[PDB]
From a paper:
Cyclic GMP-AMP synthase (cGAS) senses aberrant DNA during infection, cancer and inflammatory disease, and initiates potent innate immune responses through the synthesis of 2′3′-cyclic GMP-AMP (cGAMP). We identify SPSB3 as the cGAS-targeting substrate receptor that associates with the cullin–RING ubiquitin ligase 5 (CRL5) complex to ligate ubiquitin onto nuclear cGAS. A cryo-electron microscopy structure of nucleosome-bound cGAS in a complex with SPSB3 reveals a highly conserved Asn-Asn (NN) minimal degron motif at the C terminus of cGAS that directs SPSB3 recruitment, ubiquitylation and cGAS protein stability. SPRY-domain- and SOCS-box-containing (SPSB) proteins bind—through their SOCS box—to the elongin B–elongin C (ELOBC) heterodimeric adaptor connecting to the CUL5–RBX2 complex and recruit substrates through the SPRY domain specifying protein ubiquitylation.
To define the molecular basis of cGAS recognition by SPSB3, we determined cryo-electron microscopy (cryo-EM) structures of wild-type (WT) and C site-mutated cGAS (cGAS(K285A/R300A/K427A), hereafter cGAS(site C)) catalytic core domains in a complex with a nucleosome core particle and the SPSB3–ELOBC heterotrimer. We therefore focused on the structural analysis of the SPSB3–cGAS(site C) complex. A 3.5 Å final reconstruction of this complex reveals an intermolecular interface contributed by the C-terminal helix on cGAS (amino acids 497–515) and five variable loops extending from the bent β-sandwich core of SPSB3 opposite face of the SOCS box domain. The cGAS residues Asn513 and Asn514 form hydrogen bonds to SPSB3 loop residues Ser132, Thr162, Thr259 and Arg262. Although the overall composition of the substrate-recognition module—comprising the connecting loops extruding from the central SPRY domain29—is identical across SPSB paralogues, the residues involved in side-chain contacts to the substrate are unique to SPSB3, reflecting its specific role in cGAS binding. Notably, cGAS single substitutions of either asparagine residue of the predicted interface (Asn513, Asn514) disrupted all detectable binding to SPSB3, demonstrating that the conserved NN motif on cGAS is the main contributor to SPSB3 recognition. Single point mutations of the supporting cGAS residues (Asp465, Glu509, Tyr510, Arg512), but not the adjacent position (Glu515), weakened the interaction with SPSB3, and a combined mutation of all four cGAS residues completely blocked binding, therefore confirming their importance in reinforcing complex formation. Likewise, a combined substitution of cGAS-interacting residues on SPSB3 (Tyr160, Thr162, Thr259, Arg262) abrogated cGAS binding.
Numbering used by the authors:
A (entry chain B): 100 to 320
B (entry chain A): 161 to 522
C (entry chain C): 1 to 112
D (entry chain D): 1 to 104
Write the structure that this text describes.
Amino acid sequence: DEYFDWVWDDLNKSSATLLSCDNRKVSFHMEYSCGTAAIRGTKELGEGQHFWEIKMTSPVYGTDMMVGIGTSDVDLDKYRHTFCSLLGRDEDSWGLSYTGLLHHKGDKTSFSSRFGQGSIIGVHLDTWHGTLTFFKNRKCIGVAATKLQNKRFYPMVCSTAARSSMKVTRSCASATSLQYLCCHRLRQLRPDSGDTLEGLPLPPGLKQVLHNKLGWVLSMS
Amino acid sequence: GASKLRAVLEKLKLSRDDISTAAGMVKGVVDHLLLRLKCDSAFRGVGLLNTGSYYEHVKISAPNEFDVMFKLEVPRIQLEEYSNTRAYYFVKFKRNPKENPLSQFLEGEILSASKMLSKFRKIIAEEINDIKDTDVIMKAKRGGSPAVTLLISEKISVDITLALESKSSWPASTQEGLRIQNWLSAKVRKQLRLKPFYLVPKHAKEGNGFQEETWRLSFSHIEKEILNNHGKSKTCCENKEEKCCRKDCLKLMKYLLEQLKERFKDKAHLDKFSSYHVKTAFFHVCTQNPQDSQWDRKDLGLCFDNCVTYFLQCLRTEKLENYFIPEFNLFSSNLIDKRSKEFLTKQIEYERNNEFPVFDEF
Amino acid sequence: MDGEEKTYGGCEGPDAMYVKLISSDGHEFIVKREHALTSGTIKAMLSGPGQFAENETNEVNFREIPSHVLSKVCMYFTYKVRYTNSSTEIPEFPIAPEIALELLMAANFLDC
Amino acid sequence: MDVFLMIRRHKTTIFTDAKESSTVFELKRIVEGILKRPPDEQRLYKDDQLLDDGKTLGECGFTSQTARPQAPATVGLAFRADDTFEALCIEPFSSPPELPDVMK
Ligand SMILES: [Zn+2]
């Protein structure tokens, strides 16, 4: 895969987590687990476009394990000694729980089905129009948030299972261009087929670069 | 991690046979007590509520502390509420021809459970010395309902309780309970709705004192009956392929609750919780999910978690409704302190998030 | 705002504020200076020698781009120059899907 | 406040962002600033109907509602043919290709 674009912040993480494999794998509570533990990303998403998906490796359990986005105004170690959902508790953060429910602004909205060990979850972000999209097991679930203009964000994950970890496998970014918007429009006009290159004689090089840029768009509907 | 749950299940299973080996001693003792009571005039009609299963066991890891419940049929009575509790009742004898089981306990206009238990103790003490092939000692009181405690030699201990019975129709206070219609269809609901109900004695207490003479509805036989015939159809678990794991998920939770109390026995702050609360929550859960397809042997995991999540949410919201009296709130602040409630929430969540560390000591 | 003076009426020389774009079919679209500089090819070619003179004709002809494609290019240019870093909610860019199926070749042909 | 509009004549097809309170004569002034054609020589129309130079675009039916970001309203422009109305020199755009069935 193409080199990932950000790591979990070495200087910004809760007082109970260890990081490994060039920080690609983050591990939560290798002993007592007596509170919530959380981390942020290093790169800011306020400009351009972004996309990344996270692969799970450990059995799921506990109060809540959630993947989402938020600002830097939220504190990490405020729940160092308490079991709680940190993501989505305030208007400045969002979160999707493994139980198939979404947290935002301190409320709960059921969004999708549950997932656990071995599952792959994908998130698509479009800051220019301020819309956010979630993907699961290389399938489309649906749009979750919109009207997020002028706001700056970092990616966060929160955990509460001991003996458990999460692992970012791919991280890339791109700028707004015709290779973004026109191909999204084409996929909206070609949702039935799994592949979109069929019937298109366009050069293989631009084909491969548009894979590396928006592979899900050509392979998702 | 269902491997640990299956392993502890087998470990609990392997000690099943030792009960019947020692059951003969207690069988003989309760038989001698039964004949002794039957020669008396006060309790000429006392019988056995579970013939063929003549013992009841409350603790899942206490093969030496038996429990037995004697039934005592009563022909015709009238009941009334106490200060609008909707779970505690009085009793009265309304009209009968010349047939008096025992009216000498009638004081004022209430049959006296205090005198009931007072004579009940005296009969047991005057009888117990008659046994000569086994040393038996009768131990002090521990509660309103288990007013008698019987200890055999040193190991076997039994507490005896008594209950009344009546064939009259169930009162209107339980009209909305037992929402089984979606689970086992209304036909079974209607036929079990005419089986008798049992009134056990239980004192009422307040800040300025305690009011001793009060009764309470009991449904242990029906509670066992649904669990015995849990299947949506007659054929559930009748073949090796269709087995369902409804039964194990309750004995699992009893063991957890007993273990937590054992580990925190010093401060005694968790001594107000029993297995009744565990059983009620599981019954609510299975009413919520009546389909048999949700209880396959493979998973066990989502069902145990649903049980613990339901109990946790009930504990947080301070709401727990009795399965037969839908208005009764056992978790109300009148009975259980919020301090102990939050203590138990903290402990249960810690165990859930640490993957039940207490089960590893076994 | 009205009656802009600029002390000469413009800066059509080294700071050419209007440049002229002719399509293959003859359709003519004007763009402001930063609109022209947005496309890499236009800003690269405008940097050529002699093009900074006052009398140079600020004209570019696209013999390979028809009217509709050039119109959509100008549309995107105006959109991005006006609501760049927009504080208010940014409106969508909906084109009819029977007419916008070909805009892919515009990106790599014009380097925009 | 500015409104997104567009002005077209023959080859020319020019977008504009004049303020709503501006006048049609101000549109002529802008066209003069762009292509050195004096306001007097210019003539503006809507659809194919005559218009007055003193009227404002607000009363000419062009407002922010017509200023949709996806489609600014079109304003007709004409250059005086010596002394009279010039002919319809507008040239239609190229035909669009037919979409195949598998995108249908
Ligand atoms: Zn079954």
